[PDB]
Design a protein around this ligand. Structure first.
Ligand SMILES: Nc1nc2c(ncn2[C@H]2O[C@H](COP(=O)(O)OP(=O)(O)OP(=O)(O)O)[C@@H](O)[C@H]2O)c(=O)[nH]1
Ligand SMILES: [Mn+2]
Ligand SMILES: [Mn+2]
Ligand SMILES: [Zn+2]
Ligand SMILES: [Zn+2]
Lengths: 36, 145, 263, 146, 133, 114, 64, 83, 764, 188
C-alpha cells in the first residue's frame, strides 16, 4: 500500500525533492477526497 | 426606468416609467391583468415566450437572452453570429438545444443517405470536402484560344 | 595639445578618475564601450582534469579558473590562437598553467590561485601570472579540500575579448556622467513635491557652475564634458585600460579605411 | 498622533480576552512564509508564488552528491535573499536557499521584455549568474522469471 | 513666391496648462476690433509674458528634403526670432461675416479670426509663421 | 544547441566583407553601407562625425536585429561630394582626435602620483 | 557553494575577499556593512555578493 | 443538371475561395514543368507565376458552381471579375 | 507530422506576418519541391549542403519513387538532379507555414506566417499578433505546421495569412493593434511638448523601411530646427489616410490635445493612444486596412513599432514604488472619506438595532441592512480611489500607462494607493463561520465593516491580519470560479461548434445545413460579410423635426428655402423652377418615410449601427482627392444628384435572379443601407455641406458601388463554425447582477432548460 | 550537465509573476547608472499595475538598503516596516529615496529622459526550460491537430489543407462501381 497509494487513492506519493522548502511543504500537505 | 421616446417636436427624450419586475413567471395570466401594457410584457424565460406568443417571438426572445449574456461581460459580437445560432435553434418550429457498428446497423435498416458534405466522411473517401475551397469544381476550359 | 582634453583627479593602481573635456558624447561613450568590451587580455580557456576528488564538479571548477585574472601587460606579443600557425596551441598563442593539490592537513586545505604554476615558455613577456592583490598574497580561492582529496589539472590560457566572454574583460565598473546640474534637460526629473529636495546632488556638481533661475534655457549647448572613472581588475594596469582602449577604437576605425582601399 | 504611513488598525474595544496570538504571521504555511511582504500583495498572487516556489532550483540537501535520484537541479551559487521573513529562520531558507539577488531594472528598453518576458545580462551570465547543475540517473535491472 | 499677412499683437494671456515647454497665447490686434490669434508656442526656445507684444507674419516661402543651415549663413528669408512651419486645415470657419483660418505646426495649433484677406491666405499648406519680439 | 558561437560577433564568416556599399535608390548622392562584425561602438561614432561635415546632408545608422553584429549606415551628400569620401573624411577625424587624446592622457598620467 | 570569483554584474574580483570578511567580523568585531566597506566593496552589486554568499562547501567537506 | 450561359444568377465576381483554388491548382501544374502562358518577366516561384497568369487572364479554367438542388453554372476564369 | 512545437518570445524586429523559426527546427522540417528549370540550381546547392547545414535537404527522390537519404548515401556529394525529381528541402525564408496557440477557439488562433530562420531556440512573433493567439512570453508554446504541397501552400497564403485576419468578422473590427511598450510610448512621443532634434530625427527616419528619402520640414525652424513627435510618427502613416475623432470637448483647436485628426497621412492634432492605434472600431488600423489593403496595413504595424520603440529605447520608461504613493493631504482626505462611511454604517446600525429601519418590499430587514452597508462601503472605496487618481501627476508612470491604454485601470490605482475595499464571498459580506462571528478575535454579533470584511488599507500600506485572511477568502473564490468558467466555457465552445459546423453559404446566398435545409434565406439578413461592416450613423433618425427639415428640404419655389446660388452654378436659373421642384419633393418624401421607417426599426432612437461602406470616409477622401474649395459653387446639377443617387441604388446588388421573388429579396436586403445612402447624399448635403463637384460626386458613387460589392459575403464561407467561435471565444473571457448571469446563464440558454434559476417577468 | 541560462528559460520573483528570458545583452549595451552599475535583469513596467504586486516594489527598496547597509532586510508580514521608513534610510545613503536612479543608454551614452527604478530583488530560476520542451517530429522511417484545429481550418475554408493533413498515406487504391447499385461488384 505504501508503494501504491492504495487505501481510501493518492495517499502515498514520492517525496518531492526539488528544493528544500518544497520538501517541507510536501510533508505538510493534506487532502480532502470529494457542500463548500 | 428611463425610456427614450420621441417628443412632440421630434427629438428623443427621456421619459421615466415605473415598471414591475417579478420572481417567477406566469405569462399567460399576468398578460391579461387590467392596467398593464400587454404588447410590451417580457420574460427571460424564452420557453414561455414561445408557448404563449409563438416560435418567432421565441426566436426573438432567445436572441435577446443570448445578446444579454454577451454584453453583460461588456463584449460585442456581430449580430449575425448570434442570429445564426438562434435560427438553428428554432427552424424546426420549436426550441431545440444545441448541447460505431451499432450505428451503421441502424443506418442499414433505415436506409440513411449520407450527403457526403462533411469533412470526416470525405476523409475516409480520400476526398476534399465541399466547403470553402472545395464548394465548386474546377475544370479544363476547352472553349478558349 | 588640441583636441580632446584630459584632466585626471585621482589615480591609484586600481582606478583612475578623470574628466574628458572638449569631445562628443559619442566618442566618450564609445571609448567606455571599448574599455568594457574589446581590450585583449589573457584567460584560462581550456582546462584538462587529470584528478578531482573535490566536492565541486569539474566544469564548476573550470569556470572558476577562466575567471582568475592572469597578467596581461605583454599581451600584444601573444598571437590569438586562431591566427597562429601551430596545430592547436603553443608558446606563441598560449600560456599553460598547472594545478595540484592534495589535502594533506587534517584541517581544510584551501586552493588559491597562487598555487598556479606556469609550465611553458614565456619568452620573458610579462604574462600569465596569477594576479594577487590581497595582504596575504593568496589571490583567489578556487577550491577547498578535505584530508584525502585531490585535484590535478592543466590549463591553457589564451588571448581573448570580453565580447566573447566576460572573463576576458580588464575593466570592472566604469563610472560615467555628464551635465550633473541639468542644464542640457537631457533628463526630466520625477518628484513628488520638489525635484531638487528629492534628488541627490552629484559629486561632479562642485566642478561646474550651478545655473541661475533667470537664465532662459540654453538651446545651443552640447555635451562636451564627462566625468569618468575606470576601475581595473588588475590583469592590465589601469592607465593601460584607457590607452589600449583609445588604441583599440583607433584600430577599428583604421580597418575601415583599409577596407575602402581594398574596394 | 499616529504615523500617517502605518496601516490602520481598529483598536481593543475588549476587556475579555482569554488569549493572545503568538504571532499572526503563523497563519501561513511553509511556502507562503517565504514571500516578503505578503500583506502588500493581492491574494491570488501569493497563491501563485506558493506554487512557483516549488519549482525553483536551489540546493535541496547538502548530501546531493551522494544520492542518486531521478533528477536534481542545484544552482551553482545560491544566495540568501536580501529580504527575508522571520519564518525563514525555521525553514532554513537562509542556509539552503533557492535564488539569487539580481540587480533589476524596471524598464522599457528595446521591446524585448514585453508580455512577461525579460532581458537578462549576458556578461553576468558569463560570470555565473543563474547557472545550475542538472543530474539525471538512469537505472536497469537484470534477468528476471525466464 | 510672396508673404501674406502680417500684423502686431497684444498678448492677453499665457496658459501653459499641463505642459512645460509649450504654451497657448491668447493675443489681440492693436488695430482691428475684429482680428484675433490663439496660438501655441514653444516657450523655452522663445519665451513670452502677459501683455508682451508681437510682430506676427504668415508667409509662404524663403516639397524637397530639408538641408541644414549653410543656405542659412547668409540666406535668411527671416529677420525674425521665431519661425514655425505648418499646414492649414482650415475650417474657413467663415463665421458672422469674418473668416477663421486654422494651421498646425506639427500639432502646435493656430487660429486667426478677422476679414480683409479671404482672397489671401492659402487654401493650403506651405505655410510659415514668423515672430520678432 | 541552437546558440551561434560568440566569435561570430567580431570575426567574418567565409565570403563575408567588412563593408558592402550600395547605391541608394530613394534620393541622390546617397549610399548605404553595411558594416559586418560591428555594432553601435563604431556605428554611433562614424555617424556622429559625418554630421559635423556641412557637405553631409544625411546620416544615420541602425542595427536591425540584435542577434546579428552588423549595422547599416546611410550617408547622403552634396552634389559633387562622394559619400565614400565623406566617410574617409570622417573616419580620418576620428583617428586624429583620438591620436590626440591618448597623448593628452599618456601625459596627464606621469604628472601623477600613486 | 564557494565565494564566486567576481561580482556577476560589474566583474570586480570578489573571490579573494571571503577569508578576510569573515576575519573582519569574528576577529575585529565589525558589523557586516563596515566590514564590506573596508574591503573596498562599495557598489551594492559587489556588496550583495559577499553579504548574501552562503558557503555551502563547508558542509560538503564534512562527508567522507 | 446545367444552366445555360444566359440566365446565370450567381455572382460574376470571383470568390476568395475560387481564387485560392485556382492559383493553387495552377501553381501545382507549373511546379511539375507544365507550359506557362505568360511572360516570365523574371518570376521563378510557381504561385507567383500563377498570379501573373490570373492577372493577364490567361488561365483557361472553368469554375463549376453547384447550387444546393444539384443544378450548376459554368463560369470561366476569363470572365470572372477579380476584385 | 511535419510540425514542431516550442516556447515563444516577442520580437520587435519581426514583421507582423513573420515567425522566427530556429535553425535547428528548420533543419528538421521539410517541404518536397519538384525539380524544374526554375529551381534546379538552388535545389542543387541545397542538396550539396545536405542535412546538417541550413539551407539544405534531407532526401532526394527520383523518377522511380526511390528515396535517396542525404545523410547516409555514399553518393550524397555527387547527385545530378533530373527535371521532375523531388527534393525534400529544409524550410527557408518566406515559406508559408501555419502557426497555432492552443486551445484554438477561434480561427485567428491558427494563421499563416512567413518563416524567418533565426538562431537561438524559441519561435519568435511580433508583439501585435499576440492578442489573437491569446499568448504571451512566460512559457507559452505554440505549434508550427508545414504544408506539403503547392495547393496547400496557396490556401494558407491566400486565405489564412495574418495580414488577411487584421479585421475579423467576429466583431467587425480589427483583432490586432499596437500594445504594451509601443503603445506607452506612442502617446509619450506624441505629446505637444515632445520635440526631437536633427540627429535623432534622421535616425528615426531611416528606421522606417520605406521612407521615400525626404527629410520632412521641421515644425520649429527659428531658434533651432526641432521637429515634433507627431511629425515623426506621421512618416509611418501612409498618404491618403484621413481620420477624425472628437472626444468629450474636443474642437478644431483641441485645447487638451484630444481627439484626433489626420489628413493626407499627417497627424494634425491629438495625442495617439489606444483609441487611435489600438484594436478599435474606426481607428487607424481599421482605416488603413480598408483604404489601402491588408499588406500595407501589416507593414504599418511594423513601421510604427520600429519608430516608436527606437524612440522609447532612448527616452526610457519605468515605474516604481513611488508611483503608488499619494500626497499627505490626499491621504488625510482618503482616511476621512473612509471615516465618514464607517459613521454612515454606524447609524444605519443603531437604526436597525432600535427597529426603526424599514425594508422595502419583499426584501428582509437584514437584507436591507446589508444592501445599504455595502453601498456605503463601496461608495467609499470609490471616492477614496478617485481621490488618489486625481492627485497623481501626469508624470506618474502608473497614470501614464492608464492614459495610454496599455495596462491598468482605475481599480488598480485605487486598491494600490487608496483602499482595497469590501471583500466578498458569494455576493455577500464575509459570513459568520464561527458562531456569530467571522473570527475568534471579534466578539459576537458584530456587523461592522472590520468584522465582515472591509479592508480599509491599500496595498501600499498593507493589510492587517484579519483583512489579510478575508481578502484571501475572497481570492480563493475567484480561483475556484475561474477553474469552473474555464471548464464550463470549454465544453460550450465545443458543443456550439459541433451544432453549427456544417452551415455554409451557398451560391444562391442562402445559408444551409448539410441536408440543404434553409436556415436563413440570406446570410445575416443582408448578405454581407461581417468583416466588411462598420458602425455608421443613420442621420434621418435623430433630431427634431425642425432640424431635419433644415438639413434636407430644398424648396426651389421659395426664396428662403432654395439653394443659394453660391452653392451651385445653376443656382439663379433654378429659382422658381417647377419641374426640378417635383423631383426634389419626391426626394424629401423619401427622406420622410425613411425617418419613420427607421424609427419603427429602432424604437429607441439609436442612430449608430454596423453597415457596410463607410460613406463619410469616402466623402472625406473625395474631398482630399479633388482638392475641393469650399468657396466656389459646384457644377453639379439637381438632376445629376437626385437621379445619380437613384441609379446607384439599382446597382448594389446582393441577389441577381430575374424573377419577382428574388427581386423583392434584393430590395429588402439593401433597404437599411439605402436609407443611409439617401440620407448622406441628399441634395442640400451634397451642395451645402460636402460641396462636391460633379467629378468628385461621380467618383463618390462609383466607389460606394465597388465597395458595396466587395462587402457581399462569398459563397463557400463556413459561417457556422464562424458563428460558433465568435460566440464561444468571447464567452471564454468571462473570468468574472441578481439575475443569473454570464456563463451559467449561458448554459441555461443553450440547454433550453425547463427550470431556470431566476425566472422573471418585466411588466410595463 | 550544466545549464547556463538562455533565451527561453524561466525565472520568477516571489510575488507570483514569471517570465522567460527573451534576449541577452552584454553589459556595454545595457543601460547604466552614473556609478556604472548595470542591471542583471530588466523587467517591463507593464507587468506591474494590474497585478498590484506592491510587495515586489517594496522588496526592491528594502533590498537596496540592506545591501548598502549590510543588514538583512525585515520583509515579514504584519510589522511596522513602512515604505516611508525604508525610503528615509535609503536617502541617508545618498540615493533618491523611492529607488529611482538616472540611467544612461548603453548604445549612445546619453541620458534617459526618464529615471529608472533599480535595485536588487530575489529571483528564482525555475525548472523546465527551452531544451526539455522543443521537439520537432516530421518523419524519416501538445503538438497535434485535433478537433479544434480542424474547426479553425474549416472556418478559414481551407479544404485542401484539411484533406492533406488528415489523409492516410494508406494508398489510393482504385475500384470499379456499378452506377445503378453503387457496389464494388464490377468485374473489370
Ligand atoms: N490585459 C491585461 N492582462 C492582465 C493584466 N493583469 C494581469 N493579466 C493576467 O493574470 C492572469 C494569470 O497570470 P499569468 O500566469 O501571468 O497569466 P498567463 O501568463 O496566461 O499564465 P500561464 O497560463 O502560465 O501562461 C492571466 O489571466 C492574465 O490575464 C492587466 O492589467 N491587463
Ligand atoms: Mn503571463
Ligand atoms: Mn502565459
Ligand atoms: Zn600556436
Ligand atoms: Zn559589482
Amino acid at each position: 500500500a505504501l508503494a501504491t497509494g492504495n487505501w481510501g487513492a493518492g495517499v502515498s506519493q514520492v517525496l518531492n525533492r526539488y528544493t528544500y522548502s518544497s520538501t517541507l511543504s510536501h510533508l505538510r500537505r493534506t487532502n480532502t477526497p470529494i457542500a463548500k | 426606468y428611463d425610456r427614450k421616446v420621441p417628443s412632440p417636436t421630434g427629438e428623443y427624450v427621456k421619459e421615466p416609467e415605473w415598471v414591475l419586475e417579478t420572481d417567477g413567471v406566469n405569462l399567460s395570466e399576468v398578460m391579461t391583468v387590467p392596467g398593464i401594457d400587454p404588447t410590451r410584457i417580457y420574460t427571460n424565460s424564452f420557453i414561455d415566450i414561445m408557448e404563449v406568443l409563438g416560435i418567432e417571438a421565441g426566436r426573438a426572445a432567445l436572441y435577446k437572452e443570448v445578446y444579454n449574456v454577451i454584453a453583460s461581460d461588456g463584449s460585442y459580437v456581430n449580430y449575425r453570429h448570434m442570429a445564426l445560432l438562434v435560427d438553428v435553434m428554432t427552424t424546426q418550429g420549436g426550441l431545440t438545444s444545441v448541447t460505431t457498428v451499432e450505428i451503421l446497423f441502424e443506418a442499414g435498416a433505415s436506409a440513411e443517405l449520407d450527403d457526403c458534405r462533411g469533412v470526416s466522411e470525405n476523409v475516409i473517401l480520400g476526398q476534399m470536402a465541399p466547403i470553402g475551397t472545395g464548394a465548386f469544381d474546377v475544370m479544363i476550359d476547352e472553349e478558349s484560344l | 595639445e588640441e583636441g580632446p582634453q584630459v584632466k585626471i583627479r585621482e589615480a591609484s593602481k586600481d582606478n583612475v578618475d578623470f574628466i574628458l573635456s572638449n569631445v562628443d558624447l559619442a566618442m566618450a561613450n564609445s571609448l567606455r564601450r571599448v574599455m568594457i568590451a574589446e581590450i585583449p587580455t589573457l584567460a584560462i580557456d581550456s582546462v584538462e582534469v587529470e584528478t578531482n576528488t573535490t566536492v565541486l564538479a569539474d566544469e564548476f571548477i573550470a569556470h572558476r579558473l577562466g575567471l582568475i585574472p592572469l597578467q596581461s601587460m605583454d599581451i600584444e606579443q601573444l598571437e590569438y590562437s586562431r591566427d597562429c600557425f601551430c596545430e592547436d596551441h603553443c608558446d606563441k598563442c598560449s600560456v599553460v598553467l598547472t594545478l595540484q593539490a592534495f589535502g594533506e592537513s587534517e584541517s581544510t586545505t584551501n586552493v588559491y590561485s597562487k598555487d598556479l604554476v606556469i609550465v611553458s615558455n614565456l619568452m620573458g613577456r610579462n604574462i600569465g601570472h596569477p594576479i594577487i592583490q590581497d595582504k596575504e598574497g593568496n589571490g583567489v580561492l578556487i577550491c577547498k579540500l578535505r584530508k584525502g582529496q585531490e585535484l590535478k589539472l592543466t590549463c591553457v590560457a589564451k588571448k581573448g575579448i570580453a565580447k566573447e566572454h566576460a572573463k576576458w574583460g580588464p575593466a570592472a565598473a566604469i563610472e560615467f556622467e555628464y551635465d550633473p546640474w541639468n542644464k542640457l534637460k537631457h533628463t526630466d526629473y520625477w518628484y513628488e513635491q520638489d525635484s531638487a529636495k528629492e534628488w541627490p546632488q552629484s559629486k561632479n556638481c562642485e566642478y561646474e557652475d550651478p545655473p541661475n533661475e533667470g537664465d532662459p534655457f540654453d538651446y545651443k549647448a552640447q555635451a562636451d564634458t564627462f566625468y569618468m572613472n575606470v576601475e581595473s581588475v588588475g590583469s592590465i594596469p589601469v592607465d593601460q585600460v584607457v590607452v589600449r582602449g583609445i588604441d583599440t577604437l583607433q584600430k577599428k576605425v583604421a580597418s575601415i579605411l583599409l577596407a575602402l582601399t581594398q574596394m | 498622533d499616529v504615523d500617517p504611513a502605518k496601516r490602520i488598525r481598529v483598536s481593543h474595544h475588549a476587556t475579555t480576552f482569554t488569549h493572545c496570538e503568538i504571532h499572526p504571521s503563523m497563519i501561513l504555511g511553509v511556502a507562503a512564509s517565504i514571500i516578503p511582504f505578503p500583506d502588500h500583495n493581492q491574494s491570488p498572487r501569493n497563491t501563485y508564488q506558493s506554487a512557483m516556489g516549488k519549482q525553483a532550483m536551489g540546493v535541496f540537501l547538502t548530501n546531493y552528491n551522494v544520492r542518486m535520484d531521478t533528477m536534481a537541479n542545484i544552482l551553482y551559487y545560491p544566495q540568501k535573499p536580501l529580504g527575508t521573513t522571520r519564518a525563514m529562520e525555521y525553514l532554513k531558507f537562509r542556509e539552503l536557499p533557492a535564488g539569487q539577488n539580481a540587480i533589476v531594472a524596471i524598464a522599457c528598453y528595446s521591446g524585448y521584455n514585453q508580455e512577461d518576458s525579460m532581458i537578462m545580462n549576458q556578461s553576468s551570465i558569463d560570470r555565473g549568474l543563474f547557472r545550475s547543475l542538472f543530474f539525471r540517473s538512469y537505472m536497469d535491472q537484470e534477468k528476471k522469471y525466464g | 513666391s510672396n508673404t501674406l499677412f502680417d500684423d502686431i499683437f497684444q498678448v492677453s494671456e499665457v496658459d501653459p496648462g499641463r505642459y512645460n515647454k509649450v504654451c497657448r497665447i491668447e493675443a489681440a490686434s492693436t488695430t482691428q476690433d475684429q482680428c484675433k490669434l490663439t496660438l501655441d508656442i514653444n516657450v523655452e526656445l522663445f519665451p513670452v509674458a502677459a501683455q508682451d507684444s508681437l510682430t506676427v507674419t504668415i508667409a509662404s516661402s524663403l516639397t524637397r528634403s530639408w538641408r541644414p543651415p549653410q543656405a542659412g549663413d547668409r540666406s535668411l528669408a527671416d529677420d525674425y526670432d521665431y519661425v514655425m512651419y505648418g499646414t492649414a486645415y482650415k475650417f474657413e470657419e467663415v463665421s458672422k461675416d469674418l473668416i477663421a483660418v486654422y494651421y498646425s505646426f506639427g500639432g502646435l495649433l493656430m487660429r486667426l479670426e478677422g476679414n480683409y484677406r479671404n482672397l489671401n491666405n492659402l487654401k493650403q499648406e506651405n505655410a510659415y509663421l514668423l515672430i520678432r519680439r | 544547441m541552437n546558440a551561434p558561437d560568440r566569435f561570430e560577433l567580431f570575426l567574418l564568416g567565409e565570403g563575408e566583407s567588412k563593408l558592402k556599399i550600395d547605391p541608394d535608390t530613394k534620393a541622390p548622392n546617397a549610399v548605404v553601407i553595411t558594416f559586418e562584425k560591428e555594432d553601435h561602438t563604431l556605428g554611433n561614432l562614424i555617424r556622429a562625425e559625418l554630421l559635423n561635415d556641412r557637405k553631409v546632408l544625411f546620416a544615420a545608422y541602425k542595427v536591425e536585429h540584435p542577434f546579428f553584429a552588423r549595422f547599416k549606415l546611410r550617408i547622403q551628400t552634396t552634389e559633387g561630394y562622394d559619400p565614400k569620401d565623406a566617410l574617409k573624411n570622417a573616419c580620418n577625424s576620428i583617428i586624429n582626435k583620438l591620436g590626440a587624446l591618448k597623448t593628452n592622457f599618456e601625459t596627464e598620467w606621469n604628472l601623477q602620483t600613486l | 557553494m564557494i565565494v564566486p570569483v567576481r561580482c556577476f554584474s560589474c566583474g570586480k574580483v570578489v573571490g579573494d575577499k571571503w577569508e578576510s570578511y569573515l576575519n573582519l567580523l569574528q576577529e575585529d568585531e565589525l558589523d557586516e556593512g563596515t566590514a564590506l566597506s573596508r574591503l573596498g566593496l562599495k557598489r551594492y552589486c559587489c556588496r550583495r555578493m559577499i553579504l548574501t554568499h552562503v558557503d555551502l562547501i563547508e558542509k560538503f567537506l564534512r562527508y567522507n | 443538371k446545367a444552366i445555360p450561359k444566359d440566365q446565370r444568377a450567381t455572382t460574376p465576381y470571383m470568390t476568395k475561395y475560387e481564387r485560392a483554388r485556382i492559383l493553387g491548382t495552377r501553381a501545382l501544374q507549373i511546379s511539375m514543368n507544365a507550359p506557362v502562358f505568360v511572360d516570365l518577366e523574371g518570376e521563378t516561384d510557381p504561385l507567383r507565376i500563377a498570379m501573373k497568369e490570373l492577372a493577364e487572364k490567361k488561365i483557361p479554367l472553368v469554375i463549376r458552381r453547384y447550387l444546393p438542388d444539384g443544378s450548376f453554372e459554368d463560369w470561366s476564369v476569363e470572365e470572372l471579375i477579380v476584385d | 507530422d511535419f510540425s514542431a512545437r516550442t516556447v515563444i518570445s516577442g520580437d520587435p524586429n519581426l514583421e507582423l506576418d513573420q515567425v522566427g523559426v530556429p535553425k535547428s527546427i528548420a533543419k528538421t522540417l521539410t517541404y518536397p519541391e519538384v525539380v524544374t528549370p526554375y529551381n534546379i540550381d538552388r535545389l542543387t546547392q541545397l542538396v550539396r549542403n545536405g542535412p546538417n547545414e541550413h539551407p539544405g535537404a534531407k532526401y532526394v527522390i527520383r523518377d522511380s519513387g526511390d528515396r535517396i537519404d542525404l545523410r547516409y548515401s555514399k553518393r550524397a556529394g555527387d547527385i545530378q538532379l533530373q527535371y521532375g525529381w523531388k527534393v525534400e528541402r529544409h524550410i527557408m525564408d518566406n515559406d508559408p507555414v501555419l502557426f497555432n496557440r492552443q486551445p484554438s477557439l477561434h480561427k485567428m488562433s491558427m494563421m499563416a506566417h512567413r518563416v524567418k530562420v533565426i538562431p537561438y531556440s524559441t519561435f519568435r512573433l511580433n508583439l501585435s499578433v499576440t492578442s489573437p493567439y491569446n499568448a504571451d512570453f512566460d512559457g507559452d508554446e505554440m505549434n508550427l505546421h508545414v504544408p506539403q504541397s503547392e495547393e496547400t501552400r496557396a490556401e494558407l497564403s491566400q486565405l489564412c495569412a495574418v495580414p488577411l485576419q487584421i479585421v475579423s468578422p467576429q466583431s467587425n473590427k480589427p483583432c490586432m493593434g499596437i500594445v504594451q511598450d509601443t503603445l506607452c510610448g506612442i502617446r509619450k512621443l506624441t505629446l505637444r511638448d515632445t520635440f526631437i532634434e536633427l540627429d535623432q530625427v534622421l535616425n528615426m527616419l531611416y528606421w522606417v523601411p520605406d521612407w521615400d528619402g525626404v527629410i520632412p520640414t521641421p515644425a520649429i525652424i527659428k531658434p533651432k530646427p526641432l521637429w515634433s513627435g507627431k511629425q515623426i510618427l506621421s512618416v509611418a502613416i501612409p498618404n491618403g489616410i484621413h481620420l477624425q475623432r472628437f472626444d468629450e470637448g474636443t474642437t478644431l483647436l483641441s485645447p487638451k490635445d484630444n481627439g484626433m485628426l489626420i489628413i493626407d497621412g499627417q497627424i494634425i492634432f491629438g495625442v495617439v493612444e489606444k483609441k487611435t492605434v489600438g484594436s478599435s472600431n474606426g481607428g487607424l488600423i481599421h482605416v488603413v486596412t480598408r483604404e489601402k489593403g491588408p499588406q500595407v496595413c501589416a507593414k504599418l504595424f511594423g513601421n510604427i513599432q520600429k519608430v516608436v520603440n527606437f524612440w522609447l529605447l532612448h527616452n526610457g520608461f519605468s515605474t516604481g514604488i513611488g508611483d503608488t504613493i499619494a500626497d499627505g493631504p490626499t491621504m488625510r482626505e482618503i482616511t476621512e472619506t473612509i471615516a465618514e462611511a464607517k459613521k454612515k454604517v454606524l447609524d444605519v446600525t443603531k437604526e436597525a438595532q432600535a427597529n426603526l429601519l424599514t425594508a422595502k418590499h419583499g426584501m428582509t430587514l437584514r437584507e436591507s441592512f446589508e444592501d445599504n452597508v455595502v453601498r456605503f462601503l463601496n461608495e467609499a472605496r470609490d471616492k477614496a480611489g478617485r481621490l488618489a487618481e486625481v492627485n497623481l501627476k501626469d508624470l506618474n508612470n502608473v497614470k501614464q500607462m492608464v492614459m495610454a491604454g496599455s495596462k491598468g485601470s482605475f481599480i488598480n490605482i485605487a486598491q494600490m494607493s487608496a483602499c482595497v475595499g469590501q471583500q466578498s464571498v458569494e455576493g455577500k459580506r464575509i459570513a459568520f463561520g464561527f458562531v456569530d462571528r467571522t473570527l475568534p478575535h471579534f466578539s459576537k454579533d458584530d456587523y461592522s465593516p472590520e468584522s465582515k470584511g472591509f479592508v480599509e488599507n491599500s496595498y501600499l500600506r498593507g493589510l492587517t491580519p484579519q483583512e489579510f485572511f478575508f481578502h484571501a477568502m475572497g481570492g480563493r473564490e475567484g480561483l475556484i470560479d475561474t477553474a469552473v468558467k474555464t471548464a464550463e466555457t470549454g465544453y460550450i465552445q465545443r458543443r456550439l461548434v459541433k451544432a453549427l459546423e456544417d452551415i455554409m453559404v451557398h451560391y444562391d446566398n442562402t445559408t444551409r445545413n448539410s441536408l440543404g435545409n434553409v436556415i436563413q434565406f440570406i446570410y445575416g439578413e443582408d448578405g454581407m460579410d461581417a468583416a466588411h461592416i462598420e458602425k455608421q450613423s443613420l442621420d434621418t433618425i435623430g433630431g427634431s423635426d425642425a432640424a431635419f427639415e433644415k438639413r434636407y428640404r430644398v424648396d426651389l419655389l421659395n426664396t428662403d428655402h432654395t439653394l443659394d446660388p453660391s452653392l451651385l452654378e445653376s443656382g439663379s436659373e433654378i429659382l422658381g423652377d417647377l419641374k426640378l421642384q417635383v423631383l426634389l419633393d419626391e426626394e424629401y418624401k423619401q427622406l420622410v418615410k425613411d425617418r419613420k421607417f427607421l424609427r419603427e426599426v429602432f424604437v429607441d432612437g439609436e442612430a449608430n449601427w454596423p453597415l457596410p461602406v463607410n460613406i463619410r470616409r469616402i466623402i472625406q477622401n473625395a474631398q482630399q482627392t479633388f482638392h475641393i474649395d469650399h468657396t466656389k459653387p459646384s457644377d453639379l446639377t439637381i438632376k445629376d444628384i437626385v437621379l445619380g443617387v437613384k441609379d446607384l441604388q439599382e446597382n448594389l446588388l446582393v441577389l441577381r435572379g430575374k424573377n419577382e421573388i428574388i427581386q423583392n429579396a434584393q430590395r429588402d436586403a439593401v433597404t437599411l443601407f439605402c436609407c443611409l445612402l439617401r440620407s448622406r447624399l441628399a441634395t442640400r448635403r451634397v451642395l451645402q455641406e460636402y460641396r462636391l463637384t460633379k467629378q468628385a460626386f461621380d467618383w463618390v458613387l462609383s466607389n460606394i458601388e465597388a465597395q458595396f460589392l466587395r462587402s457581399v459575403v462569398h459563397p463557400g464561407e463556413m459561417v457556422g463554425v464562424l458563428a460558433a467561435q465568435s460566440i464561444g471565444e468571447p464567452a471564454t473571457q468571462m473570468t468574472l447582477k441578481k439575475v443569473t448571469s454570464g456563463v451559467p446563464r449561458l448554459k441555461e440558454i443553450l440547454n433550453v432548460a425547463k427550470n431556470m434559476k431566476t425566472p422573471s417577468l418585466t411588466v410595463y | 550537465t550544466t545549464k547556463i541560462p538562455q533565451i527561453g528559460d524561466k525565472f520568477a520573483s516571489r510575488h507570483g509573476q514569471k517570465g522567460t528570458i527573451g534576449i541577452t545583452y552584454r553589459r556595454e549595451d545595457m543601460p547604466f547608472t552614473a556609478e556604472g552599475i548595470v542591471p542583471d535583469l530588466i523587467i517591463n513596467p507593464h507587468a506591474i499595475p494590474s497585478r498590484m504586486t506592491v510587495a515586489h516594489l517594496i522588496e526592491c527598496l528594502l533590498s537596496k538598503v540592506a545591501a548598502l547597509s549590510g543588514n538583512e532586510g525585515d520583509a515579514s508580514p504584519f510589522t511596522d516596516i513602512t515604505v516611508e521608513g525604508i525610503s528615509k534610510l535609503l536617502r541617508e545613503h545618498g540615493y533618491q529615496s523611492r529607488g529611482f536612479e538616472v540611467m544612461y543608454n548603453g548604445h549612445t551614452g546619453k541620458k534617459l529622459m526618464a529615471q529608472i527604478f533599480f535595485g536588487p530583488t530575489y529571483y528564482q530560476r525555475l525548472r523546465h526550460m527551452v531544451d526539455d520542451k522543443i521537439h520537432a517530429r516530421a518523419r524519416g522511417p501538445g503538438l497535434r491537430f485535433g478537433e479544434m484545429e480542424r474547426d479553425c481550418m474549416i472556418a478559414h475554408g481551407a479544404a485542401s489543407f484539411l484533406k492533406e493533413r488528415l489523409m492516410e498515406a494508406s494508398d489510393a487504391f482504385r475500384v470499379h462501381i456499378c452506377g445503378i447499385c453503387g457496389l464494388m461488384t464490377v468485374i473489370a
